[PDB]
Structures are given as C-alpha cells and as structure tokens.
Amino acid sequence: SVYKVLLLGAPGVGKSALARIFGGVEHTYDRSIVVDGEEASLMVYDIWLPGHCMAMGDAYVIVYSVTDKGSFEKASELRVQLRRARDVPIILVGNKSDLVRSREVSVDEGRACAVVFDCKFIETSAALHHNVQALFEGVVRQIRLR
C-alpha cells in the first residue's frame, strides 16, 4: 500500500528533523517499510495554504515540542482546523524528549491531549532518534486499522 502523510505543527518543533531521519537525509520523502510482516510505502510531506495542506494526506502527524508550551497550544488549534476541513488517522507527537531540563509540557498533558483528540500519542527525540521509527510504523498501523 502507498500512503501520504502530512506533518503539521508550529515552527521549531522538529517536523523537518523527524522527516529527514525517516527519509534517511542529513520537502517530501518516500520510503517503503515493513510493518507487521507487510510492506507499505509512505510518502511524507514536510510542507506545513493551510487549507490545501490539510485536504490531502491519508494521515496526519501533529507535532509539538515538549520544551514549548505555546507549540502544544498550537497543536490544539491545528486539530480544530483539521476537524473543519476533513475519519482520517491522527498521531500526536511530543518531540525533543531529550531536553529534560527545559520541558514545559508534561507527559501527562500530552496523554490528556490524546484523550481529547481520541488519537495515539507518542513522545520522540529527533536528537537521539528515539521513537522515530516507532512513530511512522504507528502511522501505518493506524491507517490500516481505519
């Protein structure tokens, strides 16, 4: 299967950092990955014309930075905007988990946001490559489920 995934979020949260790691780069990315014994190719659009960007993907990844409370609030704005434009899979991502001292958003607040959105939540660190692979395999699983 071939899927389009759009990365949404406030500037500076790590969208491009996460896309490049997935794409294997040091825009858009493609890459086939095997999830649960089945291969799937994901086309990741790191392009966040808001209306135009929101009317495409087969899934959306809303990213905020755990060190930026404002970016977390922006995640809620994006979810509302998305509801006004599109039952497509949404994954909420709290990035920069490695910056422990500068955290501004707790893991609990992230999990609570996910309960409100009724979506999957994961925390990542583009700096350490932690949970990056898990994020995209998760997008594939959520798409198949829907």
Ligand X SMILES: Nc1nc2c(ncn2[C@@H]2O[C@H](COP(=O)(O)OP(=O)(O)O)[C@@H](O)[C@H]2O)c(=O)[nH]1
Query: Which residues in this chain contact ligand X in the complex, by CB under 6 A?
Result: 9, 11-17, 95-96, 98-99, 125-127
- Please say whether the beta carbons of 117 and 90 come within 8 A: yes
Q: Which is nearer to Mg ion, 56 or 114 (CB)?
A: 56
Residue 142 makes contact with Mg ion by CB under 5 A: no
Residue 13 labelled as part of a binding site: yes
Distance CA 61, CA 115 (A): 15
What's the min distance (Å) between Cβ of 24 and Mg ion? 17
Residue 47 makes contact with Mg ion by CB under 5 A: no
What's the min distance (Å) between Cβ of 73 and ligand X? 15
Touching Mg ion, residues 49-68 (CB under 5 A): none
What's the min distance (Å) between Cβ of 145 and ligand X? 27
User: Edge to edge, what strands does the sheet with 59-65 contain?
Assistant: 28-35, 38-45, 2-8, 59-65, 90-95, 120-123
Distance CA 53, CA 29 (A): 16
Residue 75 labelled as part of a binding site: no
In terms of Cβ atoms closer than 10 Å to its own Cβ (0-12, 13-18, 19+), residue 99 is middle
Residue 16 makes contact with Mg ion by CB under 5 A: yes
Residue 74 labelled as part of a binding site: no
Annotated binding site: 9-16, 95-98
Catalog residues that contact Mg ion under the rule CB under 5 A: 15-16
Write out the binding residues for GTP.
9-16, 95-98
